Amino acid sequence: AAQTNAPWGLARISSTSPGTSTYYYDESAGQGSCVYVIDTGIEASHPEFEGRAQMVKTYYYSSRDGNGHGTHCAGTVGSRTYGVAKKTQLFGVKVLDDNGSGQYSTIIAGMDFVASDKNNRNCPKGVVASLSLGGGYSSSVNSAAARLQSSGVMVAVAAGNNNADARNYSPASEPSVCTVGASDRYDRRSSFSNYGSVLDIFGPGTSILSTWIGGSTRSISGTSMATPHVAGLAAYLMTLGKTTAASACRYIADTANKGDLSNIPFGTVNLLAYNNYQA
Ligand SMILES: [Ca+2]
Ligand SMILES: [Ca+2]
Ligand SMILES: [Ca+2]
Ligand SMILES: [Ca+2]
């Protein structure tokens, strides 16, 4: 399958080369897999989600996304135009209030909620969680991401947009989960991207076009937009039976475009998420 004039990110994850704008993917498109977006919530009613998105949990007064962050990440995972896995089920878990921030205890509860809630969902192809959130190191937050992973969910987490070593952030610094840095359309490390030995993979992070609240669209930049790309790829790869929740991160890193990225610190992996799809 080929989507002409796709967002640069989608085109790049189905490319050996930068500078193309057609997304190539297997038409299965992550059907029968679920990606949990642990975020500000999802505008489920966005025509781009085609009824494939639902809010499953909130820790606030509304489950609505009054922010936009989580609607924009959800979109990069599995929206028809801006998604990697165009046929995946999106579950919205609102751990972040509409100002974009949330207590670590609430975030942990959200990660433990997904680890259980998946047993309440039809995800025969497997379960992915996209964590486009971060803060300071916390073993408790690290251990929550470890538990979600261990439970049989592929956990993808932003490295953080501090342009520092992600060893000092959570859940970015958790060894057992997929830590995602951000690249830009010219194959450069995004100036904001965290780095370090704890990074597993890079994703398109800079100027990521996706869905927004008010049934709208906009471009935004972060490791937070690299993550939904890797989250989605994992959903797509799992639906192809090409990997599992537990080994998805490895698989993605084994099959990644290697040495393609510039401004990658020594001792950080030079690996760009790649669907390795051959039309
Ligand atoms: Ca573009
Ligand atoms: Ca976003
Ligand atoms: Ca987000
Ligand atoms: Ca987002």
Curated annotation (Swiss-Prot):
Cofactor: Ca(2+)
Binding site for Ca(2+) 2: T16, D260
Sequence positions that bind Ca(2+) 1: P175, V177, D200
Enzymatic reactions: Hydrolysis of keratin, and of other proteins with subtilisin-like specificity. Hydrolyzes peptide amides
Enzyme class: hydrolase
Function recorded in the entry: Hydrolyzes keratin at aromatic and hydrophobic residues.
Name by which UniProt lists this protein: Proteinase K
Species annotation: Parengyodontium album
Gene: PROK
